[PDB]
From Swiss-Prot, chains A, B:
Superkingdom in the source lineage: Viruses
Source lineage: Viruses, Duplodnaviria, Heunggongvirae, Uroviricota, Caudoviricetes
Designated gene of the protein: sid
Task of the protein: Although P4 acquires its capsid proteins from helper phages such as P2, it possesses the ability to assemble capsids that are only one-third the size of the helper's capsid. The sid protein is responsible for the assembly of P4-sized shells. It forms a P4-specific scaffold with icosahedral symmetry on the outside of the procapsid-like particles.
Keywords for the protein's UniProt record, in alphabetical order: Late protein
Name of the protein in its database record: Glycoprotein 3
Residues represented out of the complete protein: 99 to 147 of 244
Species in which this protein is naturally found: Enterobacteria phage P4
Length: 49, 49
């Protein structure tokens, strides 16, 4: 049981780290995509407005 | 001069009528264009946001 406790602790730690890294990468991709979609296309909307 | 007076009155009248009609046409066109340009295109921005 003592050996299992620290292993479960490390498991939770690495799970949290993986979650954080995943969220960070997804955020980077979403930001780049929104910027590139707002700067390049959707221009007739500007002249219409 | 009395004949010129009513002429200038009718001149201002037809001028303001033409101006109103032009503004109305331009407004209708701009509204239709904005609606048709927002409803159809600019959809990738929605998924980006």
């Amino acid at each position: 049981n003592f050996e299992r406790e620290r292993l479960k602790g490390a498991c939770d730690s690495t799970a949290t780290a993986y979650r954080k890294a995943h969220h960070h990468l997804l955020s980077l991709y979403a930001e780049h995509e929104l910027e590139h979609a707002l700067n390049e296309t959707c221009e007739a909307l500007v002249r219409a407005m």
